[PDB]
Amino acid sequence: GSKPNYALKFTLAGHTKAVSSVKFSPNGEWLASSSADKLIKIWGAYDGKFEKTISGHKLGISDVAWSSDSNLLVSASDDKTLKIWDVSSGKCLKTLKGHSNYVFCCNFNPQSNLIVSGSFDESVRIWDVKTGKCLKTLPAHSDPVSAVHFNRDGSLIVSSSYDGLCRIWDTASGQCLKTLIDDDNPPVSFVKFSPNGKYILAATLDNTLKLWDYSKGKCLKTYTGHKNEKYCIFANFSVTGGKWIVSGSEDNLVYIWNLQTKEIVQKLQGHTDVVISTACHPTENIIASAALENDKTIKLWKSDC
Ligand SMILES: O=C(NCCCCc1ncc(CO)[nH]1)OCc1ccccc1
Numbered sequence: 001g002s003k004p005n006y007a008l009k010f011t012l013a014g015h016t017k018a019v020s021s022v023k024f025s026p027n028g029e030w031l032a033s034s035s036a037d038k039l040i041k042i043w044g045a046y047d048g049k050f051e052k053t054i055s056g057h058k059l060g061i062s063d064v065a066w067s068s069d070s071n072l073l074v075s076a077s078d079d080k081t082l083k084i085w086d087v088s089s090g091k092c093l094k095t096l097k098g099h100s101n102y103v104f105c106c107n108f109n110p111q112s113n114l115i116v117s118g119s120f121d122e123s124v125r126i127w128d129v130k131t132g133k134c135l136k137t138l139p140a141h142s143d144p145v146s147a148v149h150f151n152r153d154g155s156l157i158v159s160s161s162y163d164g165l166c167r168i169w170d171t172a173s174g175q176c177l178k179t180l181i182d183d184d185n186p187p188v189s190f191v192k193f194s195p196n197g198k199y200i201l202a203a204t205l206d207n208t209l210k211l212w213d214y215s216k217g218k219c220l221k222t223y224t225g226h227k228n229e230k231y232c233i234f235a236n237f238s239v240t241g242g243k244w245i246v247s248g249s250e251d252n253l254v255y256i257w258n259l260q261t262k263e264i265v266q267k268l269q270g271h272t273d274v275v276i277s278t279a280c281h282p283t284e285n286i287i288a289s290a291a292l293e294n295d296k297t298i299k300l301w302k303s304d305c
Helices: none
Strands: 005-012 019-024 029-034 040-044 051-052 061-066 072-077 082-086 090-096 104-107 114-119 124-128 134-138 144-151 156-161 166-168 178-184 186-194 199-204 209-213 218-223 234-236 245-250 254-258 265-270 275-280 286-291 296-304
Touching: 019 286, 029 061, 029 296, 072 114, 072 265, 082 114, 104 144, 114 144, 114 156, 124 156, 156 178, 166 186, 166 199, 178 199, 199 234, 209 245, 234 275, 245 275
Parallel strands: 019 061, 019 275, 061 104, 144 186
Antiparallel strands: 005 296, 019 029, 029 040, 040 051, 061 072, 072 082, 072 104, 082 090, 104 114, 114 124, 124 134, 144 156, 156 166, 166 178, 186 199, 199 209, 209 218, 234 245, 245 254, 254 265, 275 286, 286 296
């Protein structure tokens, strides 16, 4: 139908501190969760079946991301490292050392030969997956880096920071192509490219999401009605059914907007803390949501539309 009807199917309990992020494997079979409890957990995407725990970080994890082939994870930790994991064995393949403060955010490129990382140390780093070596250090921002994402062909990196900037980097050279948002405030708490790489979805800590045309460098859409003044809350493009924007909120709800109309089409109620992270299943109308330390659970929601 014209609107989604997401309904709770499973609650996934196990993390002992705040959940930090959830991501669906590109092949659709798994959900990965990261937590302040220093653990990665793997769950069945369709039945919420707990699969395994992946251990090794010495401090809390802020982010976890999947390789294109669904075989590897990368995690970003307060221990100042990233770890590349073999999902099948649960083994740490590489520890990426270089950041001088907490690593907050990470992603593979589509090729999954590189990792990008953002840190409290105000830098973005680009890592070789095979060797685990740092290839480039970008002096990207003047405050913690909130998010990092590659575009569809891997040629660009978008970064955001508490410095109030969103910047787009040339992957090959590490040089800045443009500063898309250039305000002193508010903090830009999240950014990512649209699936086709033409747009950037950006969250600011004034309870606002915006969709930007990258090439033109102007705002096409604004989404409001949720609460976001404190946390780096993820936002998603939902594309399997109706074309939505999905975001957690500091009022403990998941918000779903019509992308084109900007109307709120659903609020998912159930979490008992801030919903820090949502993910959209790659083929099914399924949302995963995760909450901070008063809740510590992941919820799987399913919609007919
Ligand atoms: O949002 C949080 N922590 C909650 C868990 C991590 C959530 C997260 N990881 C990656 C993303 C988006 O790329 N979002 O910290 C905000 C903060 C910042 C600076 C000083 C105090 C507090």
